[PDB]
Design a binder for these strands. Structure first.
Ligand SMILES: [Mg+2]
Ligand SMILES: [Mg+2]
Ligand SMILES: [Mg+2]
Ligand SMILES: [Mg+2]
Ligand SMILES: [Mg+2]
Ligand SMILES: [Mg+2]
Ligand SMILES: [Mg+2]
Ligand SMILES: [Mg+2]
Ligand SMILES: [Mg+2]
Ligand SMILES: [Mg+2]
Ligand SMILES: [Mg+2]
Ligand SMILES: [Mg+2]
Ligand SMILES: [Mg+2]
Ligand SMILES: [Mg+2]
Ligand SMILES: [Mg+2]
Ligand SMILES: [Mg+2]
Ligand SMILES: [Mg+2]
Ligand SMILES: [Mg+2]
Ligand SMILES: [Mg+2]
Ligand SMILES: [Mg+2]
Ligand SMILES: [Mg+2]
Ligand SMILES: [Mg+2]
Ligand SMILES: [Mg+2]
Ligand SMILES: [Mg+2]
Ligand SMILES: [Mg+2]
Ligand SMILES: [Mg+2]
Ligand SMILES: [Mg+2]
Ligand SMILES: [Mg+2]
Ligand SMILES: [Mg+2]
Ligand SMILES: [Mg+2]
Ligand SMILES: [Mg+2]
Ligand SMILES: [Mg+2]
Ligand SMILES: [Mg+2]
Ligand SMILES: [Mg+2]
Ligand SMILES: [Mg+2]
Ligand SMILES: [Mg+2]
Ligand SMILES: [Mg+2]
Ligand SMILES: [Mg+2]
Ligand SMILES: [Mg+2]
Ligand SMILES: [Mg+2]
Ligand SMILES: [Mg+2]
Ligand SMILES: [Mg+2]
Ligand SMILES: [Mg+2]
Ligand SMILES: [Mg+2]
Ligand SMILES: [Mg+2]
Ligand SMILES: [Mg+2]
Ligand SMILES: [Mg+2]
Ligand SMILES: [Mg+2]
Ligand SMILES: [Mg+2]
Ligand SMILES: [Mg+2]
Ligand SMILES: [Mg+2]
Ligand SMILES: [Mg+2]
Ligand SMILES: [Mg+2]
Ligand SMILES: [Mg+2]
Ligand SMILES: [Mg+2]
Ligand SMILES: [Mg+2]
Ligand SMILES: [Mg+2]
Ligand SMILES: [Mg+2]
Ligand SMILES: [Mg+2]
Ligand SMILES: [Mg+2]
Ligand SMILES: [Mg+2]
Ligand SMILES: [Mg+2]
Ligand SMILES: [Mg+2]
Ligand SMILES: [Mg+2]
Ligand SMILES: [Mg+2]
Ligand SMILES: [Mg+2]
Ligand SMILES: [Mg+2]
Ligand SMILES: [Mg+2]
Ligand SMILES: [Mg+2]
Ligand SMILES: [Mg+2]
Ligand SMILES: [Mg+2]
Ligand SMILES: [Mg+2]
Ligand SMILES: [Mg+2]
Ligand SMILES: [Mg+2]
Ligand SMILES: [Mg+2]
Ligand SMILES: [Mg+2]
Ligand SMILES: [Mg+2]
Ligand SMILES: [Mg+2]
Ligand SMILES: [Mg+2]
Ligand SMILES: [Mg+2]
Ligand SMILES: [Mg+2]
Ligand SMILES: [Mg+2]
Ligand SMILES: [Mg+2]
Ligand SMILES: [Mg+2]
Ligand SMILES: [Mg+2]
Ligand SMILES: [Mg+2]
Ligand SMILES: [Mg+2]
Ligand SMILES: [Mg+2]
Ligand SMILES: [Mg+2]
Ligand SMILES: [Mg+2]
Ligand SMILES: [Mg+2]
Ligand SMILES: [Mg+2]
Ligand SMILES: [Mg+2]
Ligand SMILES: [Mg+2]
Ligand SMILES: [Mg+2]
Ligand SMILES: [Mg+2]
Ligand SMILES: [Mg+2]
Ligand SMILES: [Mg+2]
Ligand SMILES: [Mg+2]
Ligand SMILES: [Mg+2]
Ligand SMILES: [Mg+2]
Ligand SMILES: [Mg+2]
Ligand SMILES: [Mg+2]
Ligand SMILES: [Mg+2]
Ligand SMILES: [Mg+2]
Ligand SMILES: [Mg+2]
Ligand SMILES: [Mg+2]
Ligand SMILES: [Mg+2]
Ligand SMILES: [Mg+2]
Ligand SMILES: [Mg+2]
Ligand SMILES: [Mg+2]
Ligand SMILES: [Mg+2]
Ligand SMILES: [Mg+2]
Ligand SMILES: [Mg+2]
Ligand SMILES: [Mg+2]
Ligand SMILES: [Mg+2]
Ligand SMILES: [Mg+2]
Ligand SMILES: [Mg+2]
Lengths: 172, 58, 185, 56, 55, 159
RNA sequence: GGUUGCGGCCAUAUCUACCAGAAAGCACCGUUUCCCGUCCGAUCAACUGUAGUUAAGCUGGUAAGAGCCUGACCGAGUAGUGUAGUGGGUGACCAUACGCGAAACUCAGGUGCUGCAAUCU
RNA sequence: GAGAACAGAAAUCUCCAGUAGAACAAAAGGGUAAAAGCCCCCUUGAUUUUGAUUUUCAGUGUGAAUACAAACCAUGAAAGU
RNA sequence: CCCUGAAAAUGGAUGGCGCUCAAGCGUGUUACCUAUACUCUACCGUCAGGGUUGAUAUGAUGCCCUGACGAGUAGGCAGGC
RNA sequence: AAUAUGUAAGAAGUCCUUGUUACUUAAUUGAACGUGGACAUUUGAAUGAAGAGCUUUUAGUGGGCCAUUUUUGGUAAGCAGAACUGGCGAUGCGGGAUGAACCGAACGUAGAGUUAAGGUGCCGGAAUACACGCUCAUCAGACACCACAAAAGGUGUUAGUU
RNA sequence: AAUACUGCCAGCUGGGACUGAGGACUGCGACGUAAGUCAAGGAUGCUGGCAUAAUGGUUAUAUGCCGCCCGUCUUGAAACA
RNA sequence: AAUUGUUGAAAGGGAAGGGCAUUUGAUCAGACA
């Protein structure tokens, strides 16, 4: 949807005479700005409680900065998505350095692999994976072997002028 | 040779050009269609209270 | 591109100078724009307009409609003002004194006014006597006393005089004008 | 915080192919041409006006 | 402040004639909601960056 | 051919209300109408005589005439690009007094009081109606009321 | 509070099965000379208030009663719907954005209120 | 539904239940239960005068209709109709 | 996503060339290009609101200030050649 | 239900006092119309208002067609017929190569600027820009309206479910 | 502590482009102890070139991009009307 | 006038003519002082 921020959002059915101080419910929402994030908040709240923006009220809307933004983390991600033929539940695993960075690339993968646009996707849970060997998918497990190294063959260097008088070399 | 039969297309366009005029309102409306027996007596009523008020500037 | 809310380039639809070509009329109009621009008196603004009115909208004021106006309480010394011609009325037998200012006085009414001891002022002598129109009583003639307005709005159940040339029975008085010949109006 | 009571509205959409109802409300809000804008006081009776013209 | 005379004060002002945003609109297509990645609707305090470029 | 009779299309319009058939209750004829009263028209299927045309159903008007069993109600039907005046001769069963004016009257007498009591106090009135203003600021308490965090739920079927 | 006459709203008053009902009133009840009506004094009319009875009518109470009425973040923000896009899909259709929003369901509570006049342990 | 000689699936007689499941000339749809239905009683208002009104509409005509006015009558104890 | 399912008549069309970690499909971020639209200015016209008969020079249907507006068949009117 | 739709939100108002009559009441009862008196702009929501009202006369037209949504007949139609709006017709300008109706935007003569829809390898003004995936087709694919493809198959490869 | 991010300043400041309508005074101000001054109701100062086909107009040609036959009837015409 | 001959100038790879713009060639007004 853009580059993502993560918000804590809090709202509560409008106070009534006979029921003042209603319950307060929170969601963590991944959106690109605070306006979309409250649109989203209300989107899901109406999928659980009887409320709608018209009869409720946001109480607090707060960015949640990554606690350890240079600590490489193995994330497990849980997602609901509709495909063309129907609607399904997935679990993927993203190895990035901050929840917000990873939710970003999830959305890329869903779009690339399963053609799911943003509207069709429900993040259900994103959480850090504490022990290794709770990592399931192998496209992550690769990157947790000990003393790991790898080269980057066939190096291509972006030419700056239209012509060239050498003849390139993909060496690295 | 058949041709089109009916449409209200574009008719509200036209009606709104010069208005849809509000119904117009007058103090002292017409007594048209009022009960005759009422009006007969009421003709005499106004006559009377007319006369009393000229007797108030005599 | 503007979504217009009103017709564009619309003329105000009020006359601006008399359509007449009378020199003298344009002079009175000259006098009275000046008066109306530099006096703040309403009477001048009214008078300025009436000078533009076409002959329809200048129905004659009868000498007897004047005599009536002077019978209003506290109106009998006022100097009546008529922006049009003033016609004689042989049906009043006693005419009061007073001063009438008009564009025209007919031979007949100028007599009846002067005879009874009054005075006939042209509208510029009136300007000199009363730049703010002090003590004036403007009279208008009856506009819908015109014959043509009998035929306006003709239609069913409107009671409104058919445009007819010859009249009498045999002349638009049967079918559609009586219960026994088809219907009535 | 208190809900805002003032709002500023600019017409985004051009002049033509507009349905009659939003089209009146654009006139009443004095936004009759593209990219002009006016201030609006927020009340029920005008919050319901803004709703009617959000596409524009 | 929306004072007692906001009606007469605000109406005293002619509609503001702004130019197009000077850096562009930010979205690819305008006639979607702000929430859906277009320009229309209530974008809340993001109106200020819009308007300031149109002034 | 086509059909366009005087009561055409009124199948449900003139039906009777569920479990509410029968004689009309005796207050309908105890209500009293005066020239100027605002009344609502709703035809009673059970009373055929003195019945409005389907057009005047749901329509409100003013009485201009009061006869033995009936009221004359003038109504402005808009034909063409204009409104015409239509007088209807209804019977008391099809008319009813409109509360569309009660709110007004309830507000007039109230407005007089608010004005007399304030004047005899020391001006400062303000008695026009104002729309709904936005909410003011407020401080909501967390005490006994911690935010219960929610997430969307996965997909299921249960059929 | 009961009852009676005349009511208003017209089931929270209706329906089904039991039980209770003091006083007064209602009631059922006795008679056929008279007015009056019947195949039939059953209904209708008259006469008695005497000769009898709470059996019924009537009023009230019971029931995991039927019905009915009311409420509810019960279902359901569901179904439907107004508005928007050069949104998805071969289509059928479907998500989304700004709004409005049911019915069934489920659980809870309830079972006539009351106006005028007369009367009553 | 339960009952009565011939009498049977259907003749006539009686009781219980019965919201209309019938009938109301006719197509159909509304409407109607001490009635709008069935039985009886008395009638001619299906009459006289001329306007207004609603539908269709041009707010013309026609057809059909509504509420009064002014008569003369019908019915009913009567309010009424 | 790709392949199979997948048959028409002159030669041939993602508009063309051509493109394959795309110059293809999904998706995100920027910058960039340009409508008779938008903002500012000049001029022309149209409409509107003001000001100005004070002589002793030259337009009073004039002169001066100010704002807004400008698509057009059939058709109307205007002012001109 | 939604959307549509009737009426009301005051000076033609509200309240006191008590006149006129042949209607009306058992009745100076009521009904209708009044004389006299009390209360002003927070006088009774919002927003707008290049003003509001009115009159006369007259042209052209009375083949329409298209789009979204609702919708009838037909297997269907670039078919036939309705509903509301918007359009074309009467209309150029930018985009969709092309094109009456789609998108954008409605035109006095010009300058400078910024944009829309749509684009930016080259044709062609404008990043052979950045980022993560996917796809290799011995008839790949490539942007709404739009110039079509289905059931059913694949141990091609990609992520998923139990 | 710092930084990012978002917002504010009636903070300072460089490069580039287009325009220069108006023609005495008059207004609202600003700087000055002051006298005066000013960027405050629309460009002036200084210097140079040519005084000519140099600039400009017309025209013919070339080049970039664009441009279908007019009239008509028609829902629709460049039409294989 | 259509249309034609001669002379002069100029352009022409399946029409011609037109719009905005500028080069080149030809031609000309005005203004300097
Ligand atoms: Mg959302
Ligand atoms: Mg929802
Ligand atoms: Mg979803
Ligand atoms: Mg590069
Ligand atoms: Mg034919
Ligand atoms: Mg046809
Ligand atoms: Mg036709
Ligand atoms: Mg005139
Ligand atoms: Mg007159
Ligand atoms: Mg005459
Ligand atoms: Mg005439
Ligand atoms: Mg005649
Ligand atoms: Mg406003
Ligand atoms: Mg909203
Ligand atoms: Mg920049
Ligand atoms: Mg730029
Ligand atoms: Mg942009
Ligand atoms: Mg785009
Ligand atoms: Mg700017
Ligand atoms: Mg039919
Ligand atoms: Mg029907
Ligand atoms: Mg009848
Ligand atoms: Mg007893
Ligand atoms: Mg009896
Ligand atoms: Mg008993
Ligand atoms: Mg008992
Ligand atoms: Mg009883
Ligand atoms: Mg029960
Ligand atoms: Mg759904
Ligand atoms: Mg919808
Ligand atoms: Mg769509
Ligand atoms: Mg299907
Ligand atoms: Mg919704
Ligand atoms: Mg349930
Ligand atoms: Mg037997
Ligand atoms: Mg028949
Ligand atoms: Mg029937
Ligand atoms: Mg009865
Ligand atoms: Mg029978
Ligand atoms: Mg007859
Ligand atoms: Mg008619
Ligand atoms: Mg007519
Ligand atoms: Mg008519
Ligand atoms: Mg009509
Ligand atoms: Mg006729
Ligand atoms: Mg007729
Ligand atoms: Mg009829
Ligand atoms: Mg792919
Ligand atoms: Mg071929
Ligand atoms: Mg292809
Ligand atoms: Mg390509
Ligand atoms: Mg291309
Ligand atoms: Mg891409
Ligand atoms: Mg940038
Ligand atoms: Mg353009
Ligand atoms: Mg231009
Ligand atoms: Mg301009
Ligand atoms: Mg002038
Ligand atoms: Mg024009
Ligand atoms: Mg001219
Ligand atoms: Mg001439
Ligand atoms: Mg609903
Ligand atoms: Mg409405
Ligand atoms: Mg008297
Ligand atoms: Mg008074
Ligand atoms: Mg108002
Ligand atoms: Mg409002
Ligand atoms: Mg205003
Ligand atoms: Mg005005
Ligand atoms: Mg005409
Ligand atoms: Mg015809
Ligand atoms: Mg005609
Ligand atoms: Mg449809
Ligand atoms: Mg068709
Ligand atoms: Mg359209
Ligand atoms: Mg049109
Ligand atoms: Mg058009
Ligand atoms: Mg167009
Ligand atoms: Mg184009
Ligand atoms: Mg486009
Ligand atoms: Mg195309
Ligand atoms: Mg678009
Ligand atoms: Mg659109
Ligand atoms: Mg090419
Ligand atoms: Mg290029
Ligand atoms: Mg770049
Ligand atoms: Mg191929
Ligand atoms: Mg093949
Ligand atoms: Mg082939
Ligand atoms: Mg290929
Ligand atoms: Mg599509
Ligand atoms: Mg398949
Ligand atoms: Mg596969
Ligand atoms: Mg699955
Ligand atoms: Mg900053
Ligand atoms: Mg600053
Ligand atoms: Mg200058
Ligand atoms: Mg100058
Ligand atoms: Mg100083
Ligand atoms: Mg200065
Ligand atoms: Mg020279
Ligand atoms: Mg020389
Ligand atoms: Mg030259
Ligand atoms: Mg020279
Ligand atoms: Mg030279
Ligand atoms: Mg030069
Ligand atoms: Mg030559
Ligand atoms: Mg040439
Ligand atoms: Mg071309
Ligand atoms: Mg031609
Ligand atoms: Mg044809
Ligand atoms: Mg045509
Ligand atoms: Mg065509
Ligand atoms: Mg043509
Ligand atoms: Mg052809
Ligand atoms: Mg060739
Ligand atoms: Mg040229
Ligand atoms: Mg000189």
């Amino acid at each position: 949807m853009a580059h993502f921020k993560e918000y804590q959002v809090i709202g509560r059915r409008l106070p009534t005479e006979s029921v003042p101080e209603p319950k307060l419910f929170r969601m963590r929402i991944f959106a690109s700005n605070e306006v979309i994030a409250k649109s989203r908040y209300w989107y899901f709240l109406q999928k659980l409680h009887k409320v709608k923006k018209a009869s409720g009220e946001i109480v607090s809307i707060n960015q949640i900065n990554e606690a350890h933004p240079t600590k490489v983390k193995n994330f497990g991600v849980w997602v609901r998505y509709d495909s063309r033929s129907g609607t399904h539940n997935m679990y993927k695993e993203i190895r990035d350095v901050s929840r917000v960075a990873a939710v970003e690339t999830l959305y890329q993968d869903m779009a690339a692999r399963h053609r799911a646009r943003f509207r069709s996707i429900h993040i259900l849970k994103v959480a850090e994976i504490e022990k290794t060997a709770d990592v399931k998918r192998q496209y992550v497990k690769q990157f947790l072997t000990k003393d790991l190294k790898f080269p980057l063959p066939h190096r291509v260097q972006k030419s700056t002028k239209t012509f060239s008088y050498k003849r390139p070399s993909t060496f690295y | 040779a058949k041709s089109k039969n009916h449409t209200a297309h574009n008719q509200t366009r036209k009606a709104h050009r010069n208005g849809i005029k509000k119904p117009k309102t007058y103090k002292y409306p017409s007594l048209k269609g009022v009960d005759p027996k009422f009006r007969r007596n009421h003709k005499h009523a106004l006559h009377g209270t007319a006369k009393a008020l000229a007797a108030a500037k005599k | 591109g503007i979504d217009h809310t009103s017709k564009q380039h619309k003329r105000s639809g009020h006359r601006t100078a008399p359509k007449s070509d009378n020199v003298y009329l344009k002079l009175l109009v000259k006098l009275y724009t000046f008066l109306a621009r530099r006096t703040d008196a309403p009477f001048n603004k009214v008078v300025l307009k009436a000078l533009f009115l076409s002959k329809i909208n200048r129905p004659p004021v009868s000498v007897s409609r004047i005599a009536r106006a002077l019978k209003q309480e506290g109106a009998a010394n006022k100097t009546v003002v008529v922006v049009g011609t003033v016609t004689d009325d042989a049906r009043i037998f006693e005419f009061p004194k007073t001063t009438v200012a008009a564009l025209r006085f007919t031979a007949g009414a100028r007599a009846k006014i002067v005879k009874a001891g009054g005075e006939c002022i042209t509208l510029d002598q009136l300007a000199v006597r009363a730049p703010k129109g002090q003590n004036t009583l403007i009279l208008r003639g009856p506009r819908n006393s015109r014959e043509a307005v009998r035929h306006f709005g003709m239609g069913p159940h409107k009671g409104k005089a058919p445009r007819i040339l010859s009249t009498g029975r045999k002349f638009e008085r049967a079918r559609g004008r009586r219960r026994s010949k088809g219907f009535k109006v | 915080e208190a809900q805002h009571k003032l709002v500023f509205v600019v017409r985004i959409k051009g002049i033509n192919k507009i349905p009659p109802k939003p089209r009146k409300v654009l006139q009443l809000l004095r936004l009759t041409r593209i990219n002009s804008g006016t201030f609006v006081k927020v009340t029920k009776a005008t919050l319901e006006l803004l709703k009617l013209i959000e596409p524009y | 402040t929306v004072g007692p005379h906001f009606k007469q004060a605000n109406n005293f002002l002619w509609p503001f004639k702004l130019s197009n945003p000077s850096g562009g609109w930010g979205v690819p297509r305008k006639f979607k909601h702000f929430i859906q990645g277009g320009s229309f609707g209530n974008r809340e305090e993001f109106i200020n960056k819009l308007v300031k470029s149109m002034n | 051919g086509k059909s366009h009779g005087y009561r055409s299309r009124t199948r449900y319009m003139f039906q009777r209300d569920f479990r509410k058939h029968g004689a009309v209750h005796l207050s309908t004829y105890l209500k009293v109408y005066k020239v100027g009263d605002i009344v609502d028209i709703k035809a009673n299927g059970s009373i055929q005589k003195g019945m409005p045309h389907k057009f005047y159903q749901g329509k409100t008007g003013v009485v201009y005439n009061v006869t033995k069993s009936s009221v004359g109600v003038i109504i402005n039907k808009m034909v063409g690009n204009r409104y015409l005046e239509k007088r209807l001769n209804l019977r008391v069963e099809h008319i009813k007094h409109s509360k569309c004016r009660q709110e007004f009257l309830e507000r007039v007498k109230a407005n007089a009081a608010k004005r007399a009591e304030a004047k005899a106090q020391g001006v400062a009135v303000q008695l026009k109606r104002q729309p709904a203003q936005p909410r003011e600021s407020r401080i909501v308490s967390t005490e006994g009321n911690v935010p219960q965090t929610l997430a969307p739920v996965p997909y299921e079927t249960f059929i």
